[PDB]
Design an enzyme around this catalytic site. Sequence first.
Site, PDB file in Angstrom:
ATOM      1  N   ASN A 119       0.807  -1.223   0.000  1.00  0.00           N
ATOM      2  CA  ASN A 119       0.000   0.000   0.000  1.00  0.00           C
ATOM      3  C   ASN A 119       0.837   1.269   0.000  1.00  0.00           C
ATOM      4  O   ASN A 119       0.340   2.346   0.329  1.00  0.00           O
ATOM      5  CB  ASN A 119      -0.972  -0.018   1.160  1.00  0.00           C
ATOM      6  N   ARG A 258       3.052   6.883  11.536  1.00  0.00           N
ATOM      7  CA  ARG A 258       2.424   6.423  12.769  1.00  0.00           C
ATOM      8  C   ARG A 258       2.177   7.590  13.709  1.00  0.00           C
ATOM      9  O   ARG A 258       2.994   8.500  13.803  1.00  0.00           O
ATOM     10  CB  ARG A 258       3.281   5.366  13.473  1.00  0.00           C
ATOM     11  N   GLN A 287      -5.159   3.353  18.437  1.00  0.00           N
ATOM     12  CA  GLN A 287      -6.237   3.167  17.465  1.00  0.00           C
ATOM     13  C   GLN A 287      -7.129   2.012  17.888  1.00  0.00           C
ATOM     14  O   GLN A 287      -6.615   0.950  18.243  1.00  0.00           O
ATOM     15  CB  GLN A 287      -5.690   2.906  16.070  1.00  0.00           C
TER      16      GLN A 287
HETATM   17  N1  LIG Z   1      -1.128   5.201   6.906  1.00  0.00           N
HETATM   18  C1  LIG Z   1      -1.038   3.925   6.337  1.00  0.00           C
HETATM   19  O1  LIG Z   1      -2.017   3.343   6.007  1.00  0.00           O
HETATM   20  C2  LIG Z   1       0.363   3.299   6.180  1.00  0.00           C
HETATM   21  C3  LIG Z   1       0.541   2.343   5.227  1.00  0.00           C
HETATM   22  C4  LIG Z   1       1.794   1.787   5.058  1.00  0.00           C
HETATM   23  C5  LIG Z   1       2.854   2.181   5.892  1.00  0.00           C
HETATM   24  N2  LIG Z   1       2.669   3.125   6.875  1.00  0.00           N
HETATM   25  C6  LIG Z   1       3.727   3.459   7.780  1.00  0.00           C
HETATM   26  O2  LIG Z   1       4.880   4.101   6.943  1.00  0.00           O
HETATM   27  C7  LIG Z   1       6.020   3.557   7.377  1.00  0.00           C
HETATM   28  C8  LIG Z   1       7.053   3.563   6.229  1.00  0.00           C
HETATM   29  O3  LIG Z   1       6.618   2.694   5.189  1.00  0.00           O
HETATM   30  P1  LIG Z   1       7.580   2.384   3.980  1.00  0.00           P
HETATM   31  O4  LIG Z   1       6.894   1.410   3.067  1.00  0.00           O
HETATM   32  O5  LIG Z   1       8.067   3.644   3.355  1.00  0.00           O
HETATM   33  O6  LIG Z   1       8.823   1.653   4.721  1.00  0.00           O
HETATM   34  P2  LIG Z   1      10.330   1.542   4.273  1.00  0.00           P
HETATM   35  O7  LIG Z   1      10.950   0.516   5.229  1.00  0.00           O
HETATM   36  O8  LIG Z   1      10.478   1.296   2.820  1.00  0.00           O
HETATM   37  O9  LIG Z   1      10.985   2.967   4.544  1.00  0.00           O
HETATM   38  C9  LIG Z   1      11.139   3.454   5.868  1.00  0.00           C
HETATM   39  C10 LIG Z   1      12.337   4.427   5.909  1.00  0.00           C
HETATM   40  O10 LIG Z   1      12.343   5.007   7.106  1.00  0.00           O
HETATM   41  C11 LIG Z   1      13.821   5.160   7.488  1.00  0.00           C
HETATM   42  N3  LIG Z   1      13.949   5.493   8.907  1.00  0.00           N
HETATM   43  C12 LIG Z   1      13.915   4.698   9.998  1.00  0.00           C
HETATM   44  N4  LIG Z   1      14.144   5.438  11.079  1.00  0.00           N
HETATM   45  C13 LIG Z   1      14.328   6.710  10.671  1.00  0.00           C
HETATM   46  C14 LIG Z   1      14.596   7.851  11.378  1.00  0.00           C
HETATM   47  N5  LIG Z   1      14.781   7.964  12.733  1.00  0.00           N
HETATM   48  N6  LIG Z   1      14.699   9.004  10.744  1.00  0.00           N
HETATM   49  C15 LIG Z   1      14.574   9.029   9.386  1.00  0.00           C
HETATM   50  N7  LIG Z   1      14.315   7.924   8.650  1.00  0.00           N
HETATM   51  C16 LIG Z   1      14.197   6.754   9.323  1.00  0.00           C
HETATM   52  C17 LIG Z   1      14.314   3.982   7.136  1.00  0.00           C
HETATM   53  O11 LIG Z   1      15.789   3.988   7.013  1.00  0.00           O
HETATM   54  C18 LIG Z   1      13.655   3.697   5.744  1.00  0.00           C
HETATM   55  O12 LIG Z   1      14.395   4.156   4.662  1.00  0.00           O
HETATM   56  C19 LIG Z   1       5.647   2.107   7.817  1.00  0.00           C
HETATM   57  O13 LIG Z   1       6.586   1.546   8.656  1.00  0.00           O
HETATM   58  C20 LIG Z   1       4.252   2.381   8.418  1.00  0.00           C
HETATM   59  O14 LIG Z   1       4.443   2.700   9.866  1.00  0.00           O
HETATM   60  C21 LIG Z   1       1.412   3.706   7.006  1.00  0.00           C
END
Ligand SMILES: NC(=O)c1ccc[n+]([C@@H]2O[C@H](COP(=O)([O-])OP(=O)(O)OC[C@H]3O[C@@H](n4cnc5c(N)ncnc54)[C@H](O)[C@@H]3O)[C@@H](O)[C@H]2O)c1
Lengths: 361, 361
Positions: A119, A258, A287
């Site tokens: 997603n 989050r 939530q």
């Molecule tokens: N609202 C929604 O419905 C929804 C849907 C999917 C994901 N999300 C959330 O989005 C987050 C990210 O998803 P994604 O697919 O991009 O994941 P991803 O793993 O591809 O990317 C996450 C990035 O965050 C970086 N990161 C970790 N800690 C960090 C920090 N302190 N400062 C800066 N960057 C940091 C990581 O190095 C990574 O590159 C998920 O973990 C989830 O919590 C929300």
Amino acid sequence: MKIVLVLYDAGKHAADEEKLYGCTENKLGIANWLKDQGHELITTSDKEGGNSVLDQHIPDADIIITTPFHPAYITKERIDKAKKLKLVVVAGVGSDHIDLDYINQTGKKISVLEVTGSNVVSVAEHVLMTMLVLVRNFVPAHEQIINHDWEVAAIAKDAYDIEGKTIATIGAGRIGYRVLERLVPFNPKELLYYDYQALPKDAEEKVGARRVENIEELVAQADIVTINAPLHAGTKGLINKELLSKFKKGAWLVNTARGAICVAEDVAAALESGQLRGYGGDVWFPQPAPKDHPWRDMRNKYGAGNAMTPHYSGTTLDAQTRYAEGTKNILESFFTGKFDYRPQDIILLNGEYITKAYGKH
Amino acid sequence: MKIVLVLYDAGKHAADEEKLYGCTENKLGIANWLKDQGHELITTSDKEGGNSVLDQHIPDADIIITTPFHPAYITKERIDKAKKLKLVVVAGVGSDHIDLDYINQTGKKISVLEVTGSNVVSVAEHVLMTMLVLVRNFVPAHEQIINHDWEVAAIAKDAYDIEGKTIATIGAGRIGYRVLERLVPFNPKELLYYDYQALPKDAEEKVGARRVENIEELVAQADIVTINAPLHAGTKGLINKELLSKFKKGAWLVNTARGAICVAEDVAAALESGQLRGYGGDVWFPQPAPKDHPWRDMRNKYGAGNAMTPHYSGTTLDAQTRYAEGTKNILESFFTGKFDYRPQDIILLNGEYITKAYGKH
Ligand SMILES: NC(=O)c1ccc[n+]([C@@H]2O[C@H](COP(=O)([O-])OP(=O)(O)OC[C@H]3O[C@@H](n4cnc5c(N)ncnc54)[C@H](O)[C@@H]3O)[C@@H](O)[C@H]2O)c1
Ligand SMILES: NC(=O)c1ccc[n+]([C@@H]2O[C@H](COP(=O)([O-])OP(=O)(O)OC[C@H]3O[C@@H](n4cnc5c(N)ncnc54)[C@H](O)[C@@H]3O)[C@@H](O)[C@H]2O)c1
Ligand SMILES: [Cl-]
Ligand SMILES: [Cl-]
């Protein structure tokens, strides 16, 4: 195997849409397969309190399937009672509702898998939408119309174009990068990112992004900040009063990552004082969000600047089929005893961190 | 010379924002500039009814300055009384609130100038925003939150991604093309356009657009249709019951062009019946939109599918300084007797059509 599946209830809405797979009524559309495979499935939305259906079944569940939009909080206390638990699956993306650090520190042999990528486009779209809604002051504009009013100046006085703004992402992974890609043709002044993982140089160049080494320097120069990192110890309460004081005055902040990456009352206070012009996104802690959660009623000085929604950006109908199929694939990898999981889906493999995105280990 | 300037009033909102040039209080920043030149400036928002301030001054106005967001309707009846009128300026883009055909067909020596390009980016952003808001079902989602509710399925049941959708624009000029450019990274299935003016092949290829020469063929295959053509005889009531019947069932329609390109009641009936899933935009006929205008209360079967705002997309603070400056430049070209207008700003030159975008002549 005994499987406990925790999803949101659709209630009356189930009758409206057959493609709503991600609710308890429809069981991700994988119930026929689980039955044919000889497994026992307990499906519930009842996830809070001592005699919840979730807690009744935790003690002999082999597998728990969760979904971030109605998240079963798999706490230390629940993990200790989960005597047969071998696998937690996330139908969606983001495993922070599970006490990952407890599993890892104790070395418990529990794998945690999520449907990586399922997603991420949906959310990148939602971020673009929320940026535009906030910057262009859409919410009070639409409210004016349905309240049978008309006063252009009341909206225009705090409406801007996204063109020419400096935009920063905290986290430049699957979602953050897709956000940057979608912003390119909007002619921002500059696209910035902060992440301990550098973008590949070709990717960086494709979106004209500049990496900023420290988060305070990042936010100080951004008109728009978007949060796209997972929730882990390094991001919990990251956006707090002190860091918000270092934002550019009157910035717009978008958080579809989050809720607990922000301190909720600090964000509300920043919006009310004008340190932020707007805040929006779909994610909350906890939530479901309580009725008195501060992000419901917070506004800027003009009665606007709030583009909050329930947690749904990652559960559009298009996303649901994708994470449903991915969930089935993860389960099959477990059932066959192959454990041939896609590497990117693995958060913990039998307690060990495989992901690099949840901080350094 | 006597200049009549018709803008929206900001009232108390003027005190909130210094950059609000587009209101009667701030007079596009040209009031002292005009006074220094010995010109008499009448400024008003009172533009309806026989003894409106507008009508009081029409008979000896040399120049009338208008703005689309609060449009002085320069009807044939008013033109017949406007004995000294030589120039009508549009602080903004779109000259349809003036009876251009009456001026042209009856030999009135009146030039009509607008500030071309001044807010085309602003509107293109607004189109993207509205598409996303409708497709992703944002309005009811935000409504849930502020009504202190929480029910993910109530929103998800009609929420989609823009990815994979087929999107068509009617009109592929400055705004329509900028909309296509901004859509490219959203990974639509295909981008389509209908316009009697072809895009250059290189411009088509840049955005992967395909021209469709028949309007019914165009809308029949589109999940999303956006209107980006001026209002003239060829587009008035273009979006009527018969065309809506050929739209893809459950399409989303966005119109930031002009309200009267749609037949108002036809759109509302299409939304209420489900032929459309959603309609949105910022433009209405007439403006200000009456309290009972049907686009205010119309909804789809779920109580959503309405993303209407008042007419403000082209009057963000970023746009206002641009059309204010461009208005000054047009006036200067007139006052000096050079008439060195930018060619793209000229709708009518002493009654003759210079623009090619208001139909063929
Ligand atoms: N609202 C929604 O419905 C929804 C849907 C999917 C994901 N999300 C959330 O989005 C987050 C990210 O998803 P994604 O697919 O991009 O994941 P991803 O793993 O591809 O990317 C996450 C990035 O965050 C970086 N990161 C970790 N800690 C960090 C920090 N302190 N400062 C800066 N960057 C940091 C990581 O190095 C990574 O590159 C998920 O973990 C989830 O919590 C929300
Ligand atoms: N909502 C706002 O605030 C706002 C702001 C600016 C402009 N607008 C409106 O948008 C319109 C377009 O602006 P623009 O800058 O893109 O103008 P433009 O002159 O650059 O492009 C207009 C295009 O529409 C085409 N067209 C004309 N008649 C058509 C028809 N029947 N079918 C298909 N295409 C047709 C023209 O050939 C041209 O390519 C303006 O005329 C104005 O009415 C609204
Ligand atoms: Cl970290
Ligand atoms: Cl035409």
